[PDB]
Design a protein around this ligand. Sequence first.
Ligand SMILES: C[N+]1(C)[C@@H]2C[C@@H](OC(=O)[C@H](CO)c3ccccc3)C[C@H]1[C@@H]1O[C@@H]12
Length: 369
Amino acid sequence: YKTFEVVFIVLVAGSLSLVTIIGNILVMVSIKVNRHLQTVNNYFLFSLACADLIIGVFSMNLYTLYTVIGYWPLGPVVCDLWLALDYVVSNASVMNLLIISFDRYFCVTKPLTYPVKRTTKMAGMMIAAAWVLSFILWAPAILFWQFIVGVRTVEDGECYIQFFSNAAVTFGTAIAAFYLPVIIMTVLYWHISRASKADLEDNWETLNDNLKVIEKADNAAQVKDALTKMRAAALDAQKATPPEMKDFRHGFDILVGQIDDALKLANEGKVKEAQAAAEQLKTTRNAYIQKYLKKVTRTILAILLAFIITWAPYNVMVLINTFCAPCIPNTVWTIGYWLCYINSTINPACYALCNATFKKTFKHLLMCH
Ligand SMILES: C[N+]1(C)[C@@H]2C[C@@H](OC(=O)[C@H](CO)c3ccccc3)C[C@H]1[C@@H]1O[C@@H]12
């Protein structure tokens, strides 16, 4: 079965690399070719997509060659450049997640001061500072530690970080570069989720949700559920208010008067007309939303959970490796490493495949024009 496993591993690894490259390239190009996708969040996600792209192109393929061949074939220089590369990139991705978490935390805790300084140049300076800090932290030690000590203990055919020859050093690295950032992002997400936990915002949110659910509906029950719940939220949104009060009160009545005419068509047997009243509900909605004036936290939690779940096994393998070396076979190390790579694979699916503008931009990129 070992001969079969070589082929299966090559196919699975190459497939994962290709999916990573295609996804992150789609994200980056989508952000660059669409101005509507040019915000601070999409700048942070742009840098994250760049790091995941570098992991998909260089790290996955070189590690696949390393494990499949059984030893390092490219030499010591390419080994040091590879280790420094994926280590710097991974560090920059971690501090990028920290940047996103602190950015959202300051958005929810300082609404009257932070958003005015939240511009494009500031986000670019933060990203550049993250990449430079990662390079300074990891590149000189990995590349030049052998010259600092005066001897290269990495024999021919091997490829590993030299100063990681001691287990406690690797464990301290795991604590400083993973566990503490994970705890920081967990506390920050805790305060953000407790901050989102105002009423009329949730009412109108429910309205624009179910109103599009009517259009996306495949069968008949979805239009009735979205209708009824949207109308409970519509009346509860009518009683709440931020003579303009008579017009505010006269948006929901002219809304409901036709709403019951739509639900009347929802129970008659022909749902195509009931769904055809949606655009009219919208052109009536515009007059109210003119005088009227979370998904982001969901995305953040998705990315954070992807990072933690994909990077936890390797780090617990380090913690166990401190006091027991035979407790972790080589295959297990390969599995954990590859999961840490899988983070970059599943990263674009946590924000790109859940945003409508990203969907339309993807469709626009994969079509004729
Ligand atoms: C590419 N990896 C698979 C390598 C091994 C792991 O290293 C870590 O988990 C440590 C913290 O234990 C780490 C090092 C640098 C940056 C972030 C984490 C995951 C990533 C990271 O670039 C290395």
